[PDB]
Design a protein around this ligand. Structure first.
Ligand SMILES: O=CN(O)C[C@@H](CC1CCCC1)C(=O)N1CCC[C@H]1C(=O)NC(=O)c1ccccc1
Ligand code: NI
Length: 192
């Protein structure tokens, strides 16, 4: 089982654990975790966070062959549970969270998109275009202890968490590009 294998003490997550488009797990809606969490579910969240930190560490990223990443969702490991990790570096970190059962509870009418577009660790190609998301979101999630957090995101951090939540709902970033005019800007779309 992917979770039993990845949560072994001796295993460091690397690109070989990340599934790519064509695997149906990326199109499946992931299952809610229950509380209390099992050790495996806690360890999985920790291992995903270690992957992100290793991926942003140039020494470790080089030794492990990693693509640097700011977010990861358990379905990208072939594990269909609603668990995500986000790590956004400050320009230590502007946002660092392991989220269980994350949910958007409120969002702005305004939309937003990264002006550079998006890629994905599960996507081995480039898909240009504005990926249209909500500009601001309020997100509820639980931590490893079962305590509820409610956070407000905007800017780049809002886009990142939205990308990962799309993963646990079976959605890919290019689902949000308008293929007819990928660079179209409707009224109410803020290009970041
Ligand atoms: O599900 C999650 N992923 O697919 C990983 C995405 C998540 C984001 C996609 C856009 C908003 C969320 C992800 O980090 N990138 C995808 C391709 C490259 C890498 C990326 O942009 N790296 C960096 O910014 C980066 C690279 C190195 C160091 C620091 C930052
Ligand atoms: Ni992704």
């Amino acid at each position: 089982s992917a979770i039993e294998r990845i949560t072994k003490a001796a295993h460091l997550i690397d690109m070989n654990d990340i599934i790519r488009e064509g695997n149906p797990t990326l199109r499946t809606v992931a299952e809610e975790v229950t509380f209390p969490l099992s050790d495996q579910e806690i360890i999985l969240g920790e291992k995903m966070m270690q992957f992100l930190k290793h991926s942003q560490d140039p020494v470790m990223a080089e030794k492990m062959g990693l693509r640097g990443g700011v977010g990861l969702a358990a379905p990208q490991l072939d594990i269909s549970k609603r668990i995500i990790a986000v790590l956004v570096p400050n320009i230590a970190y502007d946002l660092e969270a392991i989220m269980y059962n994350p949910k958007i509870v409120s969002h702005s009418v305004q939309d937003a998109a990264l002006g550079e577009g998006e890629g994905c660790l599960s996507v081995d190609r480039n898909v240009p275009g504005y990926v249209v998301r909500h500009a601001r979101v309020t997100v509820d999630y639980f931590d490893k202890d079962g305590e509820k957090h409610r956070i407000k995101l905007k800017g780049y951090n809002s886009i990142v968490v939205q990308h990962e939540i799309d993963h646990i709902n079976g959605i890919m970033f290019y689902d949000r590009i308008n293929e007819k005019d990928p660079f179209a800007v409707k009224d109410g779309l803020l290009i970041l």
